[PDB]
Design an enzyme around this catalytic site. Sequence first.
Site, mmCIF file in Angstrom:
data_model
loop_
_atom_site.group_PDB
_atom_site.id
_atom_site.type_symbol
_atom_site.label_atom_id
_atom_site.label_comp_id
_atom_site.label_asym_id
_atom_site.label_seq_id
_atom_site.Cartn_x
_atom_site.Cartn_y
_atom_site.Cartn_z
ATOM 1 N N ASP A 55 13.656 15.001 8.584
ATOM 2 C CA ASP A 55 14.823 14.163 8.300
ATOM 3 C C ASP A 55 15.329 14.194 6.861
ATOM 4 O O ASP A 55 14.704 13.640 5.956
ATOM 5 C CB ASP A 55 14.485 12.723 8.726
ATOM 6 N N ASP A 61 22.676 14.712 7.139
ATOM 7 C CA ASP A 61 21.520 14.054 7.738
ATOM 8 C C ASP A 61 20.986 14.739 8.987
ATOM 9 O O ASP A 61 21.507 14.529 10.085
ATOM 10 C CB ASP A 61 21.929 12.613 8.065
#
Length: 377
Positions: free
Chosen positions: A35, A220
């Site tokens: 992430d 992201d």
Amino acid sequence: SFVEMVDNLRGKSGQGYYVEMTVGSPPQTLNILVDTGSSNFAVGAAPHPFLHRYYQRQLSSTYRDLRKGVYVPYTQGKWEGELGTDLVSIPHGPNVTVRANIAAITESDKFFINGSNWEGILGLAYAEIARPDDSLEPFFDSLVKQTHVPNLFSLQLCGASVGGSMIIGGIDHSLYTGSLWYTPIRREWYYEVIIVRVEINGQDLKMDCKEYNYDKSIVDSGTTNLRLPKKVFEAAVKSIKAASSTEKFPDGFWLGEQLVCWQAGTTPWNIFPVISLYLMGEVTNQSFRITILPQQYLRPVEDVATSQDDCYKFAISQSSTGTVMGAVIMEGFYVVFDRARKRIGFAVSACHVHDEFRTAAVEGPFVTLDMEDCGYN
Ligand SMILES: O=S1(=O)C[C@@H](Cc2ccc(O)c(Br)c2)[C@H](O)[C@@H](NCc2cccc(C3CC3)c2)C1
């Protein structure tokens, strides 16, 4: 020696991509979500319905308690746990071992996903957004300091159940085609960039570019959709509806609630427009664009019944925390997080989507005046 990291990522559609890691001594195997939208390295360290396994500090001889709590609230889902350190390695990654901070998750809410196959998260963003505070050194920062691994990594996220590669310490020139185009990292906290223009089917939305980055724009990998600020989202949806006004879709579809279906192999891709996002370049008044095909923002999902028809979900949703370039954007592109030179690079991926008369792309150079005024303050 990057070939050893090629295809080191796996995962399920919409449940994020994860890589295999080991923590403690002897090494404990765990699948960790990759992430770039966070900066905390955390893993399940207690029983949970959605966890097939978890981190056991007791069995690790190299474990060190930091005697300090911690919690992290994501846009969706959250967890809390106990801080500490331990030795960590990546089987299909660089041949090294570093001592990194680890947050042993003891309690969570809507964080773990049923059947995702991962039991932890690896936040690759900067210390500035780490919890409890920017003093908790992020994993990648520890890796760079404790080893000779170059300060950068690249992500090749492939769609479709899904797979990809995380090249740690460099760029593998065999994972993309064409040239790499770089956009500046505006500030080192989230991987923040600046969108200077947006076009749908070659038609410019004609909005104050500040709206595109209100209140920020980030890359992201931990988010599935392309999230857009309210105003931008409305304009984009209005334009996409018109382009596909030929057919009719439930209003719940444009909200990501209802999934539209079509006869197996009869999806009217042509009625859906391509979206182009122009990003700030590396030289004065220069920018470049990435073009997204409908096969990217129309994430496929299993039939709600026994039918064998192609059903999809609108992967573009509204945001109140700025633009989010999630997996739907990254998929089909090779993305280089060149931390050492404060920039992010984009190139057409070797595992890109395939439309008959159209193709995802990264094109430059473009000229864009007053790009500086596009950043929000
Ligand atoms: O949709 S998200 O919440 C997914 C999240 C990671 C995550 C968490 C739980 C999951 O099941 C999955 Br799948 C993915 C990202 O990490 C967020 N990245 C931006 C962010 C938004 C709010 C707060 C933070 C704090 C810094 C971590 C970061 C966006």
